[PDB]
Design an enzyme around this catalytic site. Structure first.
Site, short mmCIF file in Angstrom:
data_model
loop_
_atom_site.label_atom_id
_atom_site.label_comp_id
_atom_site.label_asym_id
_atom_site.label_seq_id
_atom_site.Cartn_x
_atom_site.Cartn_y
_atom_site.Cartn_z
CG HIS B 41 42.73 37.42 51.32
ND1 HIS B 41 41.66 37.29 50.46
CD2 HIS B 41 43.00 36.17 51.77
CE1 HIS B 41 41.28 36.02 50.42
NE2 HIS B 41 42.08 35.33 51.20
N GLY B 143 36.08 31.41 45.55
CA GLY B 143 34.96 31.70 46.41
C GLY B 143 34.94 30.91 47.70
CB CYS B 145 38.74 32.73 50.70
SG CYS B 145 39.99 32.46 49.43
#
Ligand code: GT7
Ligand code: CL
Ligand code: NA
Lengths: 302, 306
Positions: B41, B143, B145
């Site tokens: 993503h 942030g 991920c």
């Protein structure tokens, strides 16, 4: 979101752990530049436990009496000196993995990460706090001496603790990296007992602020308190005195949540009076006191 | 003595953490050999997240659309492909700090260490358990991920989790390193909710054994029980069923302490029906269920990793 007991990444400290052997004793050393730091009681024998004369034991040792092993490599000891309760072994090789570092002596209530090691090799990392009685509630087995506690500011490692011994109540005592013990403890096997421990009040308040930031408000109330009335109540629960210094520290968290510091103090007084009544705060049924105001802001805001 | 929530030393994973940027989105990637792994993503804008077509979104991107930074050094992406929900960025340089590693998929109740990262820079490490509802009770900000979870088994790092998103209840969801989600979740901005969770029974028993090792014995009692009888109580209190394999796994702890496993289940039965009565166990007023039997043996024996 979420709130966890978070340690610092340990890699910078892992690259510094070595094994120190003297006689039949083996423990951990901290290898920074060309110096290996370790507890001086590595030079004690079975008859030197109660009243060791470290100056007399050290003057009898040669550099080759110290076996320092970094991984699968033996380091050559070329000098040695004592500074308070730590031994400083000069070695012929600077650690190429030495991070930016400094030594800091911390105050009660401060938190730090502990890299538990055995035979110069890390086992695990966890979070600790200097208790008001200058002990720490760690997890240490035999052979863990020389393990260090630390914080990391951006990329500089602040070494603040080195493990020396376990007290009879199962808590742990040690020194800063200058060899000065935290609290009244000494590196002797004579009978020593930690004082009665108390709760780190400013840390509890910071952790209540963390709960509000993460969206929980059930414990607040419409009341306030004076600083002295709060302390008069809190001492009866074995809580540390809250100073004006502590009120000032909580200023930023108060401004972020919109809850005045003395308003949170009143919420804490009610929690001590009522308990939690089957509810939890940030996943715990007890009030947590090993998160500093600095820890909370770092974890909740980045 | 002492018992703490203890994570694996994170050094081997810290040397694999990189920053990945695609357009205006920056998150973390895992750099192993000549491939960087990150959530797919990363290629999505805000409106793409509503209903993404990842294959179509990926076609438009070129190798130079992925900016990978390892420290202050840029990595040259020479290829990109998708495996389930993770993106695989082929780079021109093998990571010289690549550890001995495997990709493993863990089971609910298993624990692992999380290395929380932002802009490719590790900032924290903490221990999690894969909950029975396939969420983890993490601590993640924007942030984070691409942050990864792992165990260490004798110099070999087993990567088992990569962080993807936060659920409305504040818990977190992610995938294994092969892109397969843990739990009934999808990487899309839509209505998603964690299912009703349950307590990991075998882990509570392991933690009670840790308490006995550390001198906490008040909850012990004279009674024993059977698997069928205990599981009736466990179901009533939203505890996961106790299997015979769980009893076998707790075998070593049953002898190190001298307390039979079924003997301990009777202690847990009484604690569930009567509570703690103002007392604590290992400094906790709750029954802790994020220590596996192997965790308790490891910490109470001193097992090390390099
Ligand atoms: N913000 C800030 C500073 C902060 O957290 N102060 C600590 C120092 C140690 C004792 C507990 C309070
Ligand atoms: Cl301090
Ligand atoms: Na029993």
């Amino acid at each position: 979101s979420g709130f966890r007991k978070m340690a610092f990444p340990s890699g910078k400290v892992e690259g510094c752990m070595v094994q120190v052997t003297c006689g039949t004793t083996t423990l951990n050393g901290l290898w920074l530049d060309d110096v290996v730091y370790c507890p001086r009681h590595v030079i004690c024998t079975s008859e030197d436990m109660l009243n060791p004369n470290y100056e007399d034991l050290l003057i009898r040792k040669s550099n080759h009496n110290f076996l320092v092993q970094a991984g699968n490599v033996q380091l050559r000891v070329i000098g040695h000196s004592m500074q308070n309760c730590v031994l400083k072994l000069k070695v012929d090789t600077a650690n190429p993995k030495t991070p930016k570092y400094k030594f800091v002596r911390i105050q009660p209530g401060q938190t730090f990460s502990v890299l538990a090691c055995y035979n110069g090799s890390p086992s695990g990392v966890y979070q600790c706090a200097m208790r008001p009685n200058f002990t720490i509630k760690g997890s240490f087995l035999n052979g863990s001496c020389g393990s260090v506690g630390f914080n990391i500011d951006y990329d500089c490692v602040s070494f603040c603790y080195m493990h020396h011994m376990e007290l009879p109540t199962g808590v742990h005592a040690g020194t800063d990296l200058e060899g000065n013990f935290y609290g009244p403890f000494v590196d002797r096997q004579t009978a020593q007992a930690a004082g009665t421990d108390t709760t780190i009040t400013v840390n509890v308040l910071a952790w209540l602020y963390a709960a509000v930031i993460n969206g929980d408000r059930w414990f607040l109330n419409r009341f306030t308190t004076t600083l002295n009335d709060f302390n008069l109540v809190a001492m009866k629960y074995n809580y540390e005195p809250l100073t004006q210094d502590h009120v000032d520290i909580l200023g930023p968290l108060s401004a972020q949540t919109g809850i005045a510091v003395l308003d949170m103090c009143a919420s804490l007084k009610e929690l001590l009076q009522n308990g939690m009544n089957g509810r939890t705060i940030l996943g715990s049924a007890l009030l947590e006191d090993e998160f500093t105001p600095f820890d909370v802001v770092r974890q909740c805001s980045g």
